[PDB]
């Protein structure tokens, strides 16, 4: 939770032997791999992009082992839906960062052709693909937030911070490479009232603010394929990864569970003229007290 | 007309592959199914050849148009696609029946080494099957060499028949010319280095050295092989992985070229060797010693390129002899006369000069470095692959060049940046000298940060 | 039949040029095309760090003579190539001997025509795996390195030739696995997208189909 992942890896590794069920064995092994994978990013260094690539690859290897193990930990009862999806979005985020650093290095590792934006066709197209990937990642963090109805406020804020990091990188890509002219936005947010609820969140807001002001200082200064754009994006990625991931309560501990049975009238024929009349009904299940975090008074049933 | 072809076909198209069916040759070529089959066989059987095949395709299209017009005329008379259906009927006619491989394999043994063998039994089979080694199909050459190796029979075990039984056979002495010509033509079509090696060692060992015509055209095509084609030579003589087989091949090639240069140095004026030949490559080269010779310019290029690969591992005689006669010590070069106008002609062009400077044989390099133009010096310094010593000495030559006549140098210079970058690159890699050119470049281009 | 070493691809991806001086020349001959592309064209970077790294790149490949062939391959007018290829694409919608007997523009034209032909055939079909598109350049061992280099330039300089379609086409040709490996070695950041494009074609093992 506090991001101290090396010693967490040390403890989780010690716990594999003394557990009894295979599901918990996979779960503890997966936690060991995630903790080791996050500690792989501790060895990053500012303004060292080769080391950044190496560390992100080493992190992703253990992350992939861990997500395989954690998917093995799933069971009909208590299926690790939030943990699976959270780790998968971390997977995709680290892969997107690896791809972005690779492309930023490809600015110099693949000079443009004899073509007389344009004249930097490959780097511009892969910047565009990175932009689409980071926006899709932000959207997936958003629907993960929306599927997390039972989560506590801190876990929702942590997921919200993940989404905001994805949006920050995508907006930096756009305002430095793709559409600098029409992105004339003033970052006039009342940052004084940024009541950070944790040290991790505090570092998140500080790095957001630094990346955003660095982007603002470079709105129209250079041609959009300069090495300074690459340096800005890579420094944004490295600074975002330097603050370690902080798992939260909903990852480890489920409270205020709820679900819908959703009974309805039941390969069903019907006369075309006699249009279907459907009855849909359901009960809201509850684990212990119903209204612990969030209170439910609506069911916006959508049907297509 | 299409119905006429479909009705006429089963007489011969459904018959077996026996010769009398479809009156030997005549009636075969007539019947569209048969015709089509034979034509496709002949069609499947360089750029100039491709143009001939394109003309054949146009002629086939014209014949198809004529057949369609005939069908149209027939329809009109009756009242008073076609090609696809004809081709489908020809393909599906189910002819051939049998060639079973062991029957024809055992039958063929009687024609070469058995008591039935004679001159004709060898010559006809060679005229039919050895000619396939020159075809554009690589599968043709593969099948031909596999079949010849299988039927007829410590380096290159598979091709050892060409190296240890056929030259020893009685039927080689009279049928040497046709095989030599066919393989020599096939030297251009062959691709694998081991094959090229086998043909070259064969032509080194058992060629008509005495006959002037065979020796001359063999030298011409070997010259074309070693000069025109480079990647085959590159894989064959990869300097990262030298081998003793390459040593044998280079010794054989140097042996052939030493024989040719001895023969042409022995040739005197007023003989039949000097003619007004059709080919343009002919050059009358006369040495400083008064010896006269007529050889092809590409053959001279072949002789000099063979010396750029360095010494043989196990041999020094022919290499030193050829090096001495071609690039003497403390003597001038021979003067060449182009036979078309009897004027002086170039000996070492730019693509040649690059390989002379790249070569580590010192005499060749100092011979190349003599009397180099400033444009040629710019061309040479701009290229890669040159060793450090040759680069440093050429840089010193450039130092002499700038110190003597800088005017032509910065007259021809289009841009000074990238050459200054590359010359300092070559300076720092381990070369010494050339600092004057770099300093002159930086004199008008002081260093800038990035 | 030598593939690019994992150290070579990792070093090219990170542009770890200081360890690129510690790579064997037979290995370096596979990643050389992009390398020469880097040290000889428009930097589009303009950094003192990149100026020195480009200097070290030019230092390293000066000792190999194969770069002269690429320089000949790199000096052509590519506008004529893109117009001719595009006009032929609109028109439709012993080749190694010619390779030995032609200049660099003719080489580029013939191979670009062949490549566009195979990707047009595969795109027309529904993934029938027409594995017999051609075997004239892929089969002979002599034209492996040269055509591989030239394929790297013809897939880079006419950048309107897509990387994923090139990868699928090389999957359809006989000996295209090595070409795909070295081509991804030259263009390193496309590995993720090349693999992604190569995954969305077959569903199952297809009974271990070819």
From Swiss-Prot, chain A:
Cell compartments where the protein resides: Nucleus; Chromosome; Cytoplasm
Modification Phosphoserine, positions: 265
Similarity remark: Belongs to the Integrator subunit 7 family.
Subunit comment: Component of the Integrator complex, composed of core subunits INTS1, INTS2, INTS3, INTS4, INTS5, INTS6, INTS7, INTS8, INTS9/RC74, INTS10, INTS11/CPSF3L, INTS12, INTS13, INTS14 and INTS15. The core complex associates with protein phosphatase 2A subunits PPP2CA and PPP2R1A, to form the Integrator-PP2A (INTAC) complex. Interacts with NABP2.
Function: Component of the integrator complex, a multiprotein complex that terminates RNA polymerase II (Pol II) transcription in the promoter-proximal region of genes.
Name of the molecule in the record: Integrator complex subunit 7
Protein's gene: INTS7
Residues included from the entire protein: 535 to 855 of 962
UniProtKB/Swiss-Prot annotation, chain B:
Subcellular location: Nucleus; Nucleus membrane
Disulfide cysteine pairs (residue numbers): none
Top-rank taxon: Eukaryota
Spans traversing the lipid bilayer: 292-312
Family the UniProt entry places it in: Belongs to the Integrator subunit 1 family.
Assembly information from the UniProt record: Component of the Integrator complex, composed of core subunits INTS1, INTS2, INTS3, INTS4, INTS5, INTS6, INTS7, INTS8, INTS9/RC74, INTS10, INTS11/CPSF3L, INTS12, INTS13, INTS14 and INTS15. The core complex associates with protein phosphatase 2A subunits PPP2CA and PPP2R1A, to form the Integrator-PP2A (INTAC) complex. Interacts with ESRRB, ESRRB is not a core component of the Integrator complex and this association is a bridge for the interaction with the multiprotein complex Integrator; attracts the transcriptional machinery.
Medical condition linked: Neurodevelopmental disorder with cataracts, poor growth, and dysmorphic facies: An autosomal recessive neurodevelopmental disorder characterized by severe global developmental delay with motor impairment, cognitive delays, absent or severely limited speech, dysmorphic features, hypotonia and cataracts.
Stated role: Component of the integrator complex, a multiprotein complex that terminates RNA polymerase II (Pol II) transcription in the promoter-proximal region of genes.
Protein name per Swiss-Prot or TrEMBL: Integrator complex subunit 1
Lineage: Eukaryota, Metazoa, Chordata, Craniata, Vertebrata
Gene: INTS1
Whole-protein coverage range: 730 to 1317 of 2190
From Swiss-Prot, chain C:
Localization: Nucleus; Nucleus membrane; Cytoplasm
Stated name of the protein: Integrator complex subunit 2
Coiled coil: none
Family of this protein: Belongs to the Integrator subunit 2 family.
Description of how the protein assembles with itself and partners: Component of the Integrator complex, composed of core subunits INTS1, INTS2, INTS3, INTS4, INTS5, INTS6, INTS7, INTS8, INTS9/RC74, INTS10, INTS11/CPSF3L, INTS12, INTS13, INTS14 and INTS15. The core complex associates with protein phosphatase 2A subunits PPP2CA and PPP2R1A, to form the Integrator-PP2A (INTAC) complex.
Organism of this sequence: Homo sapiens
Job description of the protein: Component of the integrator complex, a multiprotein complex that terminates RNA polymerase II (Pol II) transcription in the promoter-proximal region of genes.
């Amino acid at each position: 939770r506090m991001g101290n992942h090396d010693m967490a890896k040390e403890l989780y590794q010690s716990l594999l032997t003394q557990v009894a069920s295979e599901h918990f064995y996979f779960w503890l092994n997966s936690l060991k791999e995630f903790s080791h994978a996050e500690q792989c990013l501790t060895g990053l260094q500012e303004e060292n992009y080769s080391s950044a690539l190496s560390c992100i690859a080493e992190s992703l290897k253990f992350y992939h082992k861990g997500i395989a193990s954690l998917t093995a930990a799933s069971t009909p009862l208590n299926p690790l839906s939030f943990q699976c999806e959270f780790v998968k979005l971390r997977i995709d985020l680290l892969q997107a960062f690896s791809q972005l650093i690779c492309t930023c290095n490809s600015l110099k590792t693949s000079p443009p052709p004899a073509i007389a934006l344009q004249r930097c066709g490959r780097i511009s197209n892969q910047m565009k693909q990175s932009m689409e990937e980071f926006r899709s990642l932000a959207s997936r963090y958003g629907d993960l937030y929306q599927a997390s109805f039972d989560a506590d406020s801190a876990t929702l804020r942590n997921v919200e911070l993940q989404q905001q990091s994805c949006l920050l990188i995508s907006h930096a890509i756009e305002a430095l490479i793709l559409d600098p002219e029409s992105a004339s936005f003033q970052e006039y947010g009342s940052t004084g009232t940024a009541h950070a609820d944790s040290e991790y969140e505090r570092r998140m807001m500080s790095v957001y603010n630094h990346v955003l002001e660095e982007v603002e200082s470079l709105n129209r200064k250079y041609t959009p394929v300069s090495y300074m754009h690459t340096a800005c994006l890579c420094n944004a990625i490295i600074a975002l990864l330097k603050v370690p991931l902080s798992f939260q309560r909903y990852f480890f501990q489920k409270l205020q569970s709820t679900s819908i049975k959703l009974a309805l009238s039941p390969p069903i024929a019907v006369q075309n003229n006699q249009q279907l009349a459907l009855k849909v009904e359901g009960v809201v299940q509850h684990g212990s007290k119903p209204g612990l975090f969030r209170k439910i008074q609506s069911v916006c049933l959508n049907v297509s | 007309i299409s119905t006429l072809y479909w009705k006429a076909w089963p007489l011969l198209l459904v018959v077996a592959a026996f010769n009398p069916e479809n009156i030997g040759l005549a009636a075969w070529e007539e019947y569209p199914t048969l015709k089509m089959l034979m034509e496709m066989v002949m069609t499947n059987n360089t750029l100039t050849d491709e143009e001939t095949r394109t003309e054949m395709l146009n002629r086939e299209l014209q014949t198809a148009q004529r057949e369609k017009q005939e069908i149209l005329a027939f329809e009109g008379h009756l009242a008073a696609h076609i090609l696809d259906q004809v081709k489908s009927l020809n393909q599906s006619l189910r002819l051939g029946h049998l060639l079973k491989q062991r029957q024809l394999l055992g039958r063929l043994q009687d024609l070469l080494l058995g008591p039935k063998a004679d001159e004709q039994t060898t010559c006809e089979v060679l005229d039919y099957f050895l000619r396939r080694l020159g075809s554009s199909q690589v599968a043709s050459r593969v099948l031909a060499m596999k079949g010849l190796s299988l039927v007829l029979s410590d380096v290159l075990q598979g091709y050892q028949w060409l190296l240890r039984d056929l030259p020893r056979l009685p039927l080689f002495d009279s049928v040497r010319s046709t095989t030599a010509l066919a393989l020599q033509q096939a030297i251009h079509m062959e691709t694998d280095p081991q094959t090229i090696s086998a043909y070259l060692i064969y032509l080194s060992q058992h060629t008509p050295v005495e006959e002037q015509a065979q020796h001359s055209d063999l030298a011409l095509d070997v010259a074309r092989l070693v000069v025109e084609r480079s990647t085959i030579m590159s894989h064959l003589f990869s300097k990262l992985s030298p081998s003793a087989a390459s040593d044998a091949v280079l010794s054989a090639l140097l042996s052939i070229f030493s024989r040719y240069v001895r023969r042409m140095r022995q040739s005197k004026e007023g003989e039949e060797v000097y003619s007004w030949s059709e080919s343009q490559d002919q050059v009358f080269l006369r040495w400083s010693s008064g010896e006269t010779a007529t050889m092809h310019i590409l053959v001279v290029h072949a002789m000099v390129i063979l010396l750029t690969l360095g010494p043989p591992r196990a041999d020094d005689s022919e290499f030193q002899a050829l090096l001495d006669i071609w690039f003497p010590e403390e003597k001038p070069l021979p003067t060449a006369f182009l036979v078309d106008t009897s004027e002086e002609a170039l000996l070492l062009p730019d693509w040649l000069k690059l390989r002379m400077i790249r070569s580590e044989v010192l005499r060749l390099v100092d011979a190349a470095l003599q009397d180099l133009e400033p444009q040629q010096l710019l061309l040479f310094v701009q290229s890669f692959g040159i060793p450090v010593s040759s680069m440093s000495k050429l840089l010193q030559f450039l130092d002499q060049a700038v110190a003597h006549d800088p005017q032509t140098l910065e007259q021809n210079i289009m841009d000074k940046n990238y050459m200054a970058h590359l010359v300092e690159v070559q300076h720092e890699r381990g070369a010494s000298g050339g600092q004057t050119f770099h300093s002159l470049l930086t004199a008008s281009l002081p260093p800038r940060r990035d | 039949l030598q593939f690019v070493s994992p150290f070579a691809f990792e070093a090219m991806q990170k542009v770890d040029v200081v360890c690129l001086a510690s790579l064997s020349d037979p290995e370096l001959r596979l990643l050389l095309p992009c390398l020469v592309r880097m040290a000889l064209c428009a930097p589009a970077d303009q950094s003192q760090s990149w100026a020195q790294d480009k200097k070290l790149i030019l230092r390293l490949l000066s000792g190999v003579e194969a770069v002269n062939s690429i320089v000949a391959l790199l000096s052509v007018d590519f506008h004529a190539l893109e117009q001719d290829a595009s006009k032929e694409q609109q028109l439709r919608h012993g080749l190694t001997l010619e390779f030995e007997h032609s200049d660099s523009p003719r080489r580029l034209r013939l191979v670009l025509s062949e490549l566009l032909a195979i990707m047009n055939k595969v795109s027309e079909s529904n993934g029938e795996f027409f594995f017999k598109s051609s075997e004239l350049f892929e089969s002979p061992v002599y034209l492996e390195e040269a055509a591989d280099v030239l394929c790297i330039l013809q897939a880079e300089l006419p950048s309107l030739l897509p990387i994923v379609d090139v990868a699928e086409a090389l999957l359809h040709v006989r000996n295209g696995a090595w070409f795909l490996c070295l081509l991804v070695a030259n263009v390193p950041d496309s590995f993720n997208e090349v693999c992604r494009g190569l995954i969305k074609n077959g569903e199952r093992q297809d009974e271990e189909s070819l």
